[PDB]
Amino acid sequence: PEIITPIITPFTKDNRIDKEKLKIHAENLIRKGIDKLFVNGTTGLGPSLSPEEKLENLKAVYDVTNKIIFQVGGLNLDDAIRLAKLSKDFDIVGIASYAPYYYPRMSEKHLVKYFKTLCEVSPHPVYLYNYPTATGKDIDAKVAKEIGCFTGVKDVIENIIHTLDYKRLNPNMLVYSGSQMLIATVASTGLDGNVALGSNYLPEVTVTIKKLAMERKIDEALKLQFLHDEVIEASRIFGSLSSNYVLTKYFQGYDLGYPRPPIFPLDDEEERQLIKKVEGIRAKLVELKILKE
């Protein structure tokens, strides 16, 4: 079982990638036990990044670790192809792409052709990044099998039979769940792990839940699962993608800069209110020894 972090992209106030803050974040994540870093995903604002910014994120994180899955997708296939080819110089786990977003009513033929083109040029294993609520399209287990060239899939959806279908129809595929419910997906249900949004700011929890689950300490893991869930709930008050910056700095102790508008940073009063909502949770996790004070 593996935990994969869809890593946040920190931006400066000039709205450029803060390479040094991203280096520090990646270091802390690997040191806290995260298995792999997924770069240019939804949580890292991948669609908000130009192709060159996506590449910059790869380089920054690669200085720290090879354990990278490099998201390269977009609405210009030639750009996605170019990023796939540029990745040949990086000894990483894989590249990935979401399905073409925005456009409604795209044919399965065209969607399949998009992914097969990336497979044909990829110097690395190719991962499906399946996120129907964001992209408007579902590349399900059957379509993945038609595509035939994925080494793995990240199924960002709460429909757990949907995720298990990839394993059933593609037995050699690595299958990761993007469900908020780590306890039921990380271990012991036929999947290879979880892509965990909350691991950016509380990697100790996600990793500890993983261990507890494999040791059969379900009651103990559920308690942390619930704390994790209460943080997620709180992150939605002002917007999860923006709140992830405030929460990471609060729980981990280092700044991550700003998101990219229109993912607007929380202002000082919203940050204050959000910290107030999660301060009791942090005290509990300290009392439990998952976080050092």
Choose among 124, 52, 38, 56: nearest CA to 88.
Answer: 124
Residue 268's Cβ-count burial label (10 Å; 0-12, 13-18, 19+) is exposed
> Which 8-state DSSP code applies to residue 172?
T
The answer to whether residues 192 and 153 touch, using CB atoms and an 8 Å cutoff, is no
Choose among 81, 85, 93, 86: nearest CA to 126.
Answer: 93
Binding marks (x or -) toward a copy of itself, 101..140, rule CB under 8 A? Answer: xxxxxxx-xxx-xx--x---------------xxxx----
- Joined together, the tokens standing for residue 242 give 């923006």
> Cα–Cα distances in Å, from 180 out to 1, 55, 142, 159, 184?
16, 28, 24, 11, 9
Site for a copy of itself in 17-36 (CB under 8 A): none
Q: Which is nearer to a copy of itself, 106 or 275 (CB)?
A: 106
Give least dist CB 65 to a copy of itself, A.
27
Q: Does 143 bind a copy of itself (CB under 8 A)?
A: no
Number of residues that bind a copy of itself (CB under 8 A): 62
**Out of 24, 119, 149, 160, which residue is the one contacting a copy of itself (CB under 8 A)?**
160
The answer to whether residues 88 and 122 touch, using CB atoms and an 8 Å cutoff, is no
Specify whether 249 is catalytic: no
**Out of 147, 153, 164, 197, which residue is the one contacting a copy of itself (CB under 8 A)?**
164
Give the interface with a copy of itself as residue ranges (CB under 8 A). 15, 42, 45, 47-48, 50, 75-78, 100-107, 109-111, 113-114, 117, 133-136, 158-162, 164-165, 168, 179-181, 183-185, 188-190, 216, 218, 222, 225-226, 229, 236, 238-242, 260-264
